[PDB]
Design a protein around this ligand. Structure first.
Ligand SMILES: O=c1ccn([C@@H]2O[C@H](COP(=O)(O)OP(=O)(O)OP(=O)(O)O)[C@@H](O)[C@H]2O)c(=O)[nH]1
Lengths: 124, 161, 254, 146, 65, 123, 123
């Protein structure tokens, strides 16, 4: 039941985003409602999250493949819909496995920012 | 998220002089005249400036002591070192005098005395006088008195020269 | 054929959209060319307003220390399609959420947002019809309403937009320490050697009467608003001429 | 094209362009003299003070009527709109010729002055429930009569 | 003078003086100066129904002072 | 002539309303002239006033049909164009016959609105 | 190589001129920097200098035509790009053939205006 409910919810938002994307194309993101922006942000994270590096495309992707368990996927997508991961950067969901991978790429990204702010301070 | 303070954009800060510093004999005064957030003179060197505050008139010359003046509806004169006089009329505001040699007159409305007209003032004065008798209440009477006083000051300035 | 008919209709429809928007750019181009006069005629009005409310201070102590109402008067346009100017203001307000925070926004599109995102911190907002060059009376009305909203307010923070160049628009803040505590700080500026730039200016105010000081505080606080609201307009026309060109390079791609 | 969603500016090109568009409205073919004269009058600005709604009525009076003769003010010797044989003279001699230019301008100026003085003045003073309808019927009739 | 005793604030006094000064300007320049006084604004609060309930904390026009 | 003039005026207004519908989409109805808004209001009433319940479609609509005389149509449409029926609510023109039926639906619409206001007042 | 370089420079200047046209029609002509103003002036001269009178049109247009050799064309445009002819009036390039025609037409313009001054100074 959890698998069905989560899968339906994801598709519902991916359907909302497509409709919103038609408004976004012409006018822009700033011309949306306050809640609409929240839907857009969650949907964009969902779209990025769906990506996965395969073990056979390591040459093209240049990254080690991932094998996500069925239970991990269900629990990981459930949280993203709930908003629990609304504070994680968008690009932390791109080319990852489960949510554990998401929360580690986010850490590396934040640490790498310290090599762009500490260096900035050294330059300044 | 360090909100840049709006004043920081304005790099033309005020030059305040320390008390113990040695004296300097100044020959010009930097006047900064502003109307409704629009300056007419930018640190213009002038010989002197005459401003009519609440207590009375003030003739500000270079080196005048630091002071704050609450202006009243009246004319304002600026005399340059060349020997040229320029007269405006102000409706109110404040004038800041600095011992360093600067005078900033920020008024709500500052217009050339020439732009004003006499007959327009006369008819407006008559209308206000007529409306004063028909004042709805005390507040209306005070408002009309304020309007009458401004008009009388304008007429007096025009008749002076 | 229907499919060909559909596409032909869509193309001309988008062409009609490009036309109604190309006109907007011409309009907002005029309201910006004419409004570019302020840049040359600014930055000297508030010189001594600096010495009044130019207190370089931290963003935490000034917030946590206060235990009375903190009035905020963000400035927003009453019409959409102006970049993220209206958007960023809401984000700044959200970052300063507090128990004492209160919002008294300006503009129809500021009222639309703050009303619902901060229901517990809303009293009312002001709106301006843009048929008039922003005048002193408009600033006074805002100030009077702000006082009546919370007379015992620790501070009034006005958040507006600043226009540096044709495209560099930022968010700017004016802080107006409540008179009662401004008098106290003017005391330190008159006695202690601390605050030397504000030693002379502080002393001259002290020499005068209290009513003049109160008039001075209200006058320059109002004059500060006359720059806040007056400047946001210039930024508005800048973004509305920078996202009306972005809407015409997306219609031309579709 | 640049004022679809904004208040227009009443410049000379627009003041005359609107009249030209209005004049093109017609049901039956127009005789050459009537058409060319009307276009010339609008081209030189004689209809600048005439409202766009009254252009058709102004043209009808110019063609099928003669205000100058009505009020005993016409001074032209030969150039009158009721002389339908002037068409070939106009074809041979352009309107911008000394033979016809002098009298053409005089007739247009006099007709315009009389129309503004008498007819359009009364039109702008119509305030009633039946006069408005009568005026509306008049304008529609002129739109499809000339 | 007598307006202080009635509770009128200084800012309102400034607005009245400026409005009177603008009314005294010549016709030609009045086209510009008069624009700098006209109080074309209101104060609104959105209610549950969405109506913009107008507030009366401060008068808008000088005559309302 | 009255029939011809009224018909042409109706079509011309509904052609203008199509243009102004685009501007109301790119911009809002709050950015239109004071005359454009009047055209929009009357045009919207014209669109709804053209609707009519047929006596054969009672099952589809659930209401009795109407048979409008030729002269009633010309008079009613002329009045709307000239501004006579400008204070009548827009929905009073929806699924009705002559103006006499428009005014009766308005009174019915106003009475029910008054009842709703009274109910709200008691609350 | 010289022909290719000149042609590319002209194309680049024309493209920049179009970009500067957008800016001057937005912010104002005075907002252009010193380099931009010079580019605008040179580009306008190039646009005027690309027009040529054809010998076929002598009867109708009256003005004698010109056959510009390639060698002259490269030198004429190359000099203009550098800035040698920055003092010649803009109109001297309109419907003329070759650099020499630009100069002779300048004489005829400078000398023509000389009489105008003696007239306007006098009278
Ligand atoms: O009863 C009083 C006492 C004091 N004051 C006011 O308090 C201030 C005392 O300040 P000062 O004693 O320094 O006045 P001053 O010599 O600078 O006065 P001016 O020539 O500039 O007018 C002055 O501004 C004085 O007018 C009154 O108005 N009334």
């Amino acid at each position: 039941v959890d698998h069905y409910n989560v899968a339906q919810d994801v598709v519902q938002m991916l359907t909302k985003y497509r409709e919103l994307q038609d408004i976004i194309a012409v006018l822009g993101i700033d011309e949306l409602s306050e809640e609409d922006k929240l839907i857009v942000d969650r949907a964009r994270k969902l779209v990025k999250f769906l990506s996965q590096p395969f073990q056979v495309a390591e040459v093209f992707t240049g990254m080690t493949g991932h094998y996500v368990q069925l239970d991990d996927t269900i629990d990981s997508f459930s949280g993203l819909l709930m908003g629990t991961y609304d504070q994680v950067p968008e690009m932390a969901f791109y080319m990852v496995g489960g949510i554990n991978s998401v929360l580690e790429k986010a850490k590396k990204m934040a640490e790498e920012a310290a090599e762009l702010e500490k260096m900035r301070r050294a330059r300044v | 998220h360090d909100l840049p303070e709006g004043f920081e954009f304005m790099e033309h800060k005020v030059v305040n002089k320390d008390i113990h510093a040695p004296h300097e004999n100044l020959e010009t005064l930097r006047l900064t005249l502003t109307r409704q957030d629009e300056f007419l003179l930018r640190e213009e060197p002038v010989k002197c400036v005459t401003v009519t505050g609440t207590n009375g008139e003030y003739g500000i010359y270079p080196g005048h002591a630091y002071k704050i003046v609450q202006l009243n509806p009246s004319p304002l004169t600026v005399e340059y070192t060349d020997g040229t006089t320029k007269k405006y009329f102000v409706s109110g505001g404040f004038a800041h005098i600095n011992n360093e040699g600067s005078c900033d007159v920020n008024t709500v409305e500052c217009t050339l005395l020439d732009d004003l007209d006499l007959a327009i003032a006369e008819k407006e004065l008559a209308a206000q006088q007529a409306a004063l008798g028909s004042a709805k209440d005390d507040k209306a009477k005070s408002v009309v008195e304020i309007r009458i006083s401004v008009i009388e000051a304008v007429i007096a300035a025009l008749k002076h020269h | 054929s229907g499919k060909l008919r559909l596409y032909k209709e869509k193309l001309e429809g988008y062409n009609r959209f490009y036309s109604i928007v190309k006109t907007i750019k011409m309009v907002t181009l005029a309201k910006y060319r004419a409004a570019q006069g302020r840049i040359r005629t600014r930055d000297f009005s508030l010189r001594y307003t600096e010495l009044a409310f130019s207190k370089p201070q931290a963003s935490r102590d000034a917030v946590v220390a206060a235990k009375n109402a903190l009035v905020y008067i963000p400035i927003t346009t009453n019409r959409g399609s102006c970049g993220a100017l209206n958007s960023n203001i809401v984000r700044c307000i959200d970052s300063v959420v507090s128990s004492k925070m209160v919002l008294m926004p300006v503009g129809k599109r500021g009222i639309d947002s703050f009303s619902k995102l901060y229901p517990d911190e809303f009293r009312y907002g002001i709106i301006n019809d843009m048929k008039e060059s922003m005048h002193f009376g408009y600033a006074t009305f805002v100030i009077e309403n702000a006082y009546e909203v919370s007379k015992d307010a620790d501070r009034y923070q006005v958040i507006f937009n600043r226009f540096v160049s044709a495209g560099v628009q930022r968010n700017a803040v004016y802080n107006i320490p409540s008179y009662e505590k401004w008098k106290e700080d003017l005391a330190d500026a008159a006695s202690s050697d601390n605050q030397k730039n504000r030693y002379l200016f502080a002393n001259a105010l002290q020499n005068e009467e209290e009513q003049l000081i109160r008039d001075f505080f209200d006058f320059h606080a109002a004059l500060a608003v006359l720059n806040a609201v007056g400047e946001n307009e210039l930024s508005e026309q800048a973004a509305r001429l920078v996202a009306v060109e972005g809407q015409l390079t997306n219609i031309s791609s579709l | 094209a640049d004022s679809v969603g904004g208040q227009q500016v009443q410049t000379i090109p627009m003041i005359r362009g609107a009249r030209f568009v209005a004049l093109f409205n017609q049901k039956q073919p127009s005789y050459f003299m009537n058409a060319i004269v009307s276009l010339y009058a609008c081209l030189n600005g004689y209809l600048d003070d005439v409202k766009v709604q009254y252009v058709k009525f102004y043209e009808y009076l110019l063609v099928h009527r003669d205000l100058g003769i009505m009020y005993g003010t016409a001074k032209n010797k030969f150039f009158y709109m009721y002389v339908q044989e002037l068409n070939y003279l106009i074809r041979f001699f352009t309107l911008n010729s000394p033979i016809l230019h002098g009298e053409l301008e005089e007739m247009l100026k006099q007709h315009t002055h009389l129309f503004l003085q008498h007819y359009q003045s009364k039109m702008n003073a119509i305030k009633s429930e039946k006069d408005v309808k009568a005026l509306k019927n008049l304008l529609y009739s002129c739109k499809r009569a000339v | 003078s007598s307006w202080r005793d009635h509770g009128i604030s200084y800012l309102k006094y400034l607005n009245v003086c400026t409005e009177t000064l603008h009314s005294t300007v010549k016709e030609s320049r009045r086209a510009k100066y008069e624009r700098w006084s006209k109080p074309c604004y209101t104060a609104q609060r959105p209610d549950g129904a969405g109506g913009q309930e107008t507030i009366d904390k401060v008068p808008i026009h000088t005559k309302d002072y």
